[PDB]
Amino acid sequence: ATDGSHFDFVIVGGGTAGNTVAGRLAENPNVTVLIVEAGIGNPEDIPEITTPSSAMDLRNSKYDWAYKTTMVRRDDYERIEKPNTRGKTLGGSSSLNYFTWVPGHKATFDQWEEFGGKEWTWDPLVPYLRKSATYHDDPRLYSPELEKIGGGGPIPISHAELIDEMAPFRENLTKAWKSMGQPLIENIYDGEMDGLTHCCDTIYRGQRSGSFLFVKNKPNITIVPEVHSKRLIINEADRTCKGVTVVTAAGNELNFFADREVILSQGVFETPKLLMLSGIGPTRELSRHGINTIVDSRHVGQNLMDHPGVPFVLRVKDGFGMDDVLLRHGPKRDAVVSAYNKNRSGPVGSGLLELVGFPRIDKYLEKDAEYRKAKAANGGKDPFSPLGQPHFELDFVCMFGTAFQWHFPTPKTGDHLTVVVDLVRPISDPGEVTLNSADPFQQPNINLNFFANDLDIIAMREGIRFSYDLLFKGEGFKDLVESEYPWEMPLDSDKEMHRAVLDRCQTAFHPTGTARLSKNIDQGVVDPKLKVHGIKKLRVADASVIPIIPDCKIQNSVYAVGEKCADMIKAEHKDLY
Ligand SMILES: Cc1cc2nc3c(=O)[nH]c(=O)nc-3n(C[C@H](O)[C@H](O)[C@H](O)COP(=O)(O)OP(=O)(O)OC[C@H]3O[C@@H](n4cnc5c(N)ncnc54)[C@H](O)[C@@H]3O)c2cc1C=O
Numbered sequence: 245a246t247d248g249s250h251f252d253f254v255i256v257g258g259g260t261a262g263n264t265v266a267g268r269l270a271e272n273p274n275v276t277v278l279i280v281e282a283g284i285g286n287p288e289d290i291p292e293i294t295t296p297s298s299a300m301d302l303r304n305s306k307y308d309w310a311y312k313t314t315m316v317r318r319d320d321y322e323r324i325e326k327p328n329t330r331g332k333t334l335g336g337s338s339s340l341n342y343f344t345w346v347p348g349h350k351a352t353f354d355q356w357e358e359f360g361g362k363e364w365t366w367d368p369l370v371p372y373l374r375k376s377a378t379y380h381d382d383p384r385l386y387s388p389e390l391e392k393i394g395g396g397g398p399i400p401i402s403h404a405e406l407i408d409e410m411a412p413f414r415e416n417l418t419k420a421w422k423s424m425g426q427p428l429i430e431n432i433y434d435g436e437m438d439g440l441t442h443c444c445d446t447i448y449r450g451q452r453s454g455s456f457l458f459v460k461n462k463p464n465i466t467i468v469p470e471v472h473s474k475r476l477i478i479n480e481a482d483r484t485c486k487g488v489t490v491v492t493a494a495g496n497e498l499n500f501f502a503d504r505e506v507i508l509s510q511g512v513f514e515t516p517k518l519l520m521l522s523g524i525g526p527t528r529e530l531s532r533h534g535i536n537t538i539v540d541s542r543h544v545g546q547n548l549m550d551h552p553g554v555p556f557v558l559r560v561k562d563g564f565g566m567d568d569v570l571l572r573h574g575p576k577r578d579a580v581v582s583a584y585n586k587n588r589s590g591p592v593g594s595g596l597l598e599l600v601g602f603p604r605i606d607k608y609l610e611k612d613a614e615y616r617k618a619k620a621a622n623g624g625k626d627p628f629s630p631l632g633q634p635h636f637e638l639d640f641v642c643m644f645g646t647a648f649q650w651h652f653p654t655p656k657t658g659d660h661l662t663v664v665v666d667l668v669r670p671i672s673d674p675g676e677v678t679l680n681s682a683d684p685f686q687q688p689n690i691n692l693n694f695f696a697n698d699l700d701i702i703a704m705r706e707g708i709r710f711s712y713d714l715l716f717k718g719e720g721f722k723d724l725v726e727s728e729y730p731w732e733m734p735l736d737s738d739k740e741m742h743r744a745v746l747d748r749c750q751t752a753f754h755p756t757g758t759a760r761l762s763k764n765i766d767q768g769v770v771d772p773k774l775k776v777h778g779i780k781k782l783r784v785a786d787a788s789v790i791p792i793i794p795d796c797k798i799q800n801s802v803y804a805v806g807e808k809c810a811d812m813i814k815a816e817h818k819d820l821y
Contacts, residue, residue, distance in 0.1 A: 245468045247498045251278040252820070253813070254502040255509055256473055256488050256518070258285075259336020260455045260799060261786040262509030264376060264806030267398065267458030269813060270465050275820055278466045278500055279459060280490050283307060283333035285469030287456050293339050295584070296447045296595045297570055300647040302340040307333045311513065313690035313751075314675075315552075321746045325650060328690065328751060334469060335454035336511060341753065341799060342647075343445040343452065343595040344639070345401050347373045348794030348801060350435025351631035359762045359791035360772040366435050372804040372811075373433075377401040380448055386430060393433045393444070398457045399803070400448030404598040407591045410642050413564045413661075413724075417599055417640060420718025426603055437634055437795065443600040446799065450584065450593020455803070471498065473514075474684045476506065476522035478538055478779065485782035491684070504817060507783045507809065508759075508776075515788040516545035516677045516758040517688040519769070524776065525679075533682045539778035543769045545677035545688070545758050549793045551637075552694040553666040553752040554704055554745055555648035557655075557729040558715060564724050565659030566591060566643040596645075601638035602668075602796065604629065608706035615702055628669040628703060633795045636707045637752075639664035644729075650750055652730045660729065663715070665707045666752045668795045672696040677758050694749055704749070705741040708733060754798040759788035773812050774805075785809035 255266045258281035270277045284290070284307070292298040292305065304310055310327035331337035350366040357365050379394030380402045394401060406414070421440040422428065429439030446453040459465050471490035477499060478485055487501035508515050519525055523538035525545060530537045562568070569576050569591060584592035606626070609615040618627055628635055641648070644655055645662035675693035680686050695701050712735060715721050734740035762768025765777035770789060776782040787802050794801045814821035 245278070245466055245500070248501070249278070250501045250503050251276040251466065252502065252504045253277045254487055254500055254506045255279045256476070256506065257281060257336065257508070257510035257514070257786070258334040258456070258459070258467065258469070259331065259509055259511055259786060260338040260802045261806035261809070262507070263335065263455035263458040264803055265507050265509065265785045265810045265813070266465060267462065268807065268810035270459070270462045272820055273462070273464050276464055276466070278468065280471050280473065280488060280500065281334050281467070281469045282472050283331070283469060285334050285467050287333045287335050287339045287454060293333065293454070294452050295592060296343060296450065296452055297592045299340060299342050299595065300645060303327055303329050303647050307331060307340055309687070311687045311690060313692060315692055315750065316694050316746055317691055318696065318746070323747070325750065329753065330511060330513065334467070335456040338446070338455045338799060339452070342597060343447050344597060344600065344797045345377070345444040345446055345800055346600070346796040347433055348796050349437055349633040351633055352792055352795050356791055359760065359768060361763070363772060364761065369804060369808070371395065372807040373800055375807045376803040386442065390431060390433070399446060399453045399455070401444050401446055401453065402448050403442050403444050404595065405447065405450065405593065406598060407566065407594050407642070409563065409569070409591070410566070410598065413642055414599060416720035416724055420714055420721035421601065423719035424714055432602070437602045438604070440599055440601045442598065445595050447593070447595050450588035472685065473510065473518055474521070476508070476518060476782065477501070478522055480538055482780070483778065484780045502781065505781045505783060505813060507785050509784070509786045512548065512755040512758050512787045513677055513688055513690060515784055515786055517679065519544050519759060519776070520679055521682060521684060524779065529679060533679050535682055539765070541765055541769050541777060543760065543762070543767070546674065547757040547760050548675040548677055548690070548692065548755060549757040550675070550692050550694070550755040551666050551668055551752040551793065552670060552700065552704060552749045553648070553664050554708055554749045555645070555662055555664045556708065556711070556733055556748070557644060557649060558661045558663070559655070559658045559726045559729055560661050560724045561726060562659055565661055566596060567659045571643060571654070596643050597639050597641050599640050601640070602634035602636070603638065603710060604635045605703070605706050605710050608710055609703065612702050612706070615699065618699055627671050627699060633669055635667070635669055635703065636710070637666040637668050637796050638711055639666065648750065655729060658726070661715070663711050664752065665704065665711055667700060667704050667707060670700045670703070672700050674757060692751060692755070695746060701742055701745050704745045705738070708741070709735055754793060756787045756790035756793045756798065759784045760791045761789045762791065774809050783809060783813070
């Protein structure tokens with residue numbers, strides 16, 4: 245690509261929303277679209293990217309930004325971790341995520357109206373939540389009604405391609421779930437999600453469905469990988485964004501210009517950073533690093549919101565986890581690896597997560613005096629999910645998961661279940677993404693501020709207790725549990741649970757909100773059309789725009805944001821669409 249080139253649209257960051265916006269805008273083959281991306285351009289060529297069972301091994305790989313981020317910052321406890329995994333490749337974090345495809349609760353999306361007006365509520369957003377996907381049910385295992393969740397887009401999705409050997413696992417987990425009086429549910433896509441479900445995945449035929457599927461075989465898309473953004477090109481007199489400056493592998497600075505619009509899609513952490521490096525952010529934060537303020541945008545990098553998770557591992561009877569097939573080397577692994585290389589069948593093509601629970605835990609919360617005081621203090625409404633939303637997403641990963649055990653060694657023997665207790669409706673104040681310096685090659689400073697509010701600790705403790713009650717007492721599954729790893733979860737002591745939750749928690753990998761959609765610059769940084777407040781020809785389309793975090797894994801809302809962004813761009817450029 246030649247220095248100084250003009251394109252109709254420039255997408256900065258070839259990630260999840262970025263490739264969505266780019267591929268959609270290229271559907272007029274006459275429209276020129278450029279994508280600049282820090283990582284490789286050929287992820288479909290990388291077996292670890294395309295193979296679903298390899299997803300966790302991508303942590304700390306060359307495709308992981310591997311940021312340091314502060315998980316918790318309380319007066320009694322603070323912890324910083326590395327890596328906070330983020331995709332560094334075309335496809336962004338959709339090239340290394342764990343595939344689950346779930347929208348979230350209608351009541352939550354309706355509340356986005358406070359930020360985006362009526363067009364950002366559940367009903368208008370449903371088509372955008374489905375437009376990216378083509379649904380498949382090859383083994384004809386699920387209700388025909390659910391083909392509605394795919395609108396026909398280039399991301400193939402399916403219910404998990406079930407591992408045959410895990411069917412006893414699945415059958416005892418289901419029995420245990422029902423034995424605790426909690427519903428089963430398969431249609432979690434119409435605004436309601438109460439119960440245990442067979443999840444859908446961005447996996448089809450044993451292959452990962454990443455956002456790069458949007459931007460291939462489209463000659464009007466110029467893809468420039470391996471370039472690192474320096475700054476957006478802003479004209480102050482015009483108050484207009486003209487393009488972007490990037491740095492190449494050889495250390496050369498290139499300017500690419502957009503003749504219509506630039507769309508910033510660098511994800512929740514680098515989008516606020518690049519905005520700030522370009523003169524759009526909190527004015528004193530900018531001054532403190534020698535950056536001129538073009539627009540005093542107080543919310544840039546603020547309102548970082550994520551889900552905390554406390555994972556825990558149980559060792560289970562042999563044959564009720566996949567550790568011995570996929571994790572440990574030997575004939576069993578060689579066998580399924582051999583089958584995969586010939587036709588991409590077998591469990592090597594599995595994302596290892598097939599049942600997911602979305603419970604409320606009201607009866608656990610009610611046993612805590614502090615929760616009772618707080619609910620009464622909120623006028624009798626549950627502080628976490630006052631509109632009936634789930635309290636947790638419980639991922640039952642059917643193997644020891646290194647990506648959820650950041651400080652314990654991998655067990656040398658045995659089969660395991662990794663339960664990821666994900667608090668999806670926390671009430672802690674948000675964190676922030678701040679600049680370390682004006683250096684584009686340094687990571688922003690990242691504070692997730694998990695568990696700022698003690699009530700989130702109480703909730704997370706009870707979500708662990710719920711999960712333990714389910715697996716140790718529930719019918720059928722109670723017989724499968726051999727031991728706890730690496731030691732007993734101290735559920736008999738509230739005070740020990742306090743320490744355990746803080747010390748064992750991690751990100752569930754759903755950061756949002758750092759450039760949020762809003763009605764004005766005093767509320768957020770982009771408007772309901774995703775235009776940056778105070779700047780012409782600049783939109784943001786990624787997780788940083790999300791104003792209230794969905795009640796589940798978030799890749800579905802992030803694709804929807806990209807789809808809607810492209811539609812609102814097309815509607816404005818009528819001479820092109
Ligand atoms: C472990 C992991 C596990 C999960 N698990 C599941 C899952 O199971 N299901 C689910 O729904 N969500 C999952 N998620 C959340 C879900 O994946 C995430 O929320 C969405 O994928 C987020 O979608 P954006 O579009 O908002 O952000 P993006 O990062 O994709 O794209 C940004 C792009 O910009 C480029 N880029 C950045 N900076 C520069 C720069 N300086 N110069 C030049 N280029 C730069 C950068 O290289 C990248 O290409 C999971 C993510 C992680 C891990 O990140």
